[PDB]
Symmetry: C2
Subunit: 141 residues, 2 copies
Amino acid sequence: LKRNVRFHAFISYSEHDSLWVKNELIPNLEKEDSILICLYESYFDPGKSISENIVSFIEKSYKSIFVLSPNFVQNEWCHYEFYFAHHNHIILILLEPIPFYCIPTRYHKLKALLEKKAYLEWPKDRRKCGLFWANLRAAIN
Amino acid sequence: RNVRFHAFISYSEHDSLWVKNELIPNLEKEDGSILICLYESYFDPGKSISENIVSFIEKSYKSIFVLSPNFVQNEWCHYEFYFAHHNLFHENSDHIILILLEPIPFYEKKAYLEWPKDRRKCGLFWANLRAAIN
C-alpha cells in the first residue's frame, strides 16, 4: 500500500525521446484533462540526493511509466539500477527496439523483461496507434 | 582551458559535515575566493543526471571525489558511467583527485589521498590537497 502519493504517473525518459513524450504520451494521459504527472525536469530537488529523488518519483506516484529505447538504456538506466536491483504499478513502453547485444550485462531484470516481452510496443504503423493507446489506458486505470 | 570552477566536489550527504566544515574551509583558508562546484548549487534539471555530472567535471579544473562506504553504497552508482567511459579503472586522469575519507573494505589501486587517523598529519593532508588542485 503506497504512501504520500502526490501524482497519478511518473514518466521516466531520455530527453532524446522528448517529442514523443510531450507531443503524444502526455496529451493522451491528460484525457482526464486533473491528472497529475511527475517529471524529473519539474520535480528533481537538488536539496536531496540523486537516488532519493528517483525513489520519490516512483514511490509518490500511482504508476511509473518507463519509456524504453537505445538512448534510455545507454544513458539513463544506470541511475535506476540501484532501485530495481532490489525492487520488483510499473509500466514499460518500448518506444524504439533495443538490440539485446547493446544492453549492459549487469542489467539482468531489464534484459529479462525485454525477453518475455513485458512491455507495450509503440507501433510505427499509425493505424495501429488506437490499439496502443487503448492498451495503455487498460494498463494504467 | 574553458573551465568555470577550480574544483567540483562529489560526496555523499552523510559526509557533508566533513565536506563543509573541513574540506571547503581549508581550500578557502589559503584561497579565500576559490571557485567550487557543488551538485546542490549547480544541478540543472534542464540537463540529464549524467549530463549534469559530465558538466560538473568538464567545467572544473579538478574533480575531487570524497570516498567512503557512504559514497560507495549510495553515490558511486551515479558516477561510474564517467569512470567506465574514460577507462579510469586501468588508466589515470590528472584532473581527478580521490580522497579516501574512510577506509573501504573490499567486502583505483593506491593513487588516492588518505585522510589521516592521526590528527597531527591533518596539516600535511591539506598541504597535499592544495598541491593536487593547484
